[PDB]
Design a protein around this nucleic acid. Structure first.
Length: 59
DNA sequence: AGTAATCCCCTTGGCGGTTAAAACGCGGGGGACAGCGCGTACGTGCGTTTAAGCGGTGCTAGAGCTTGCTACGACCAATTGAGCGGCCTCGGCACCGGGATTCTCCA
């Protein structure tokens, strides 16, 4: 759904269940409302956006 | 070593429908229940006798307790196969339909 249609603004996503898996490359912005103590997991989360096929500069 | 997210699983709850089971109406029948008469069978009282109960005497079986030990079960470590969990299939039992036999009830 999120990848299909640009009317959806925001994607709420838990850090561990949601950080690991598939591309989310029609986002452009990643907000850590809270940041994991293990920096790898925040890196995985950031790179669900910052990825091959990423549309725009990730902030 | 702790506490919280993640993920399996299994129980509870809701929605729809479909139809089979519960509820409702009504006539009548026959079974519940009150009433009657009799008669025989159980409670009562008496005289009879029978043996249960008590106080007393005698014996020995065997319940109850101690001693001594060795035969039998508790405990452990190594071995293995009998018994359990998972997968498969085919044949027994159900379920249906249809015609045959039985049973019931009013004539």
């Amino acid at each position: 759904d999120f990848q299909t249609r640009p009317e959806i603004f925001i994607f709420l996503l838990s850090t561990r269940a949601g950080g690991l898996g598939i591309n989310l490359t029609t986002a452009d912005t990643v907000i850590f409302y809270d940041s994991d103590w293990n920096p790898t997991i925040d890196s995985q989360a950031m790179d669900r956006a910052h990825r091959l096929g990423q549309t725009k500069q990730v902030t």
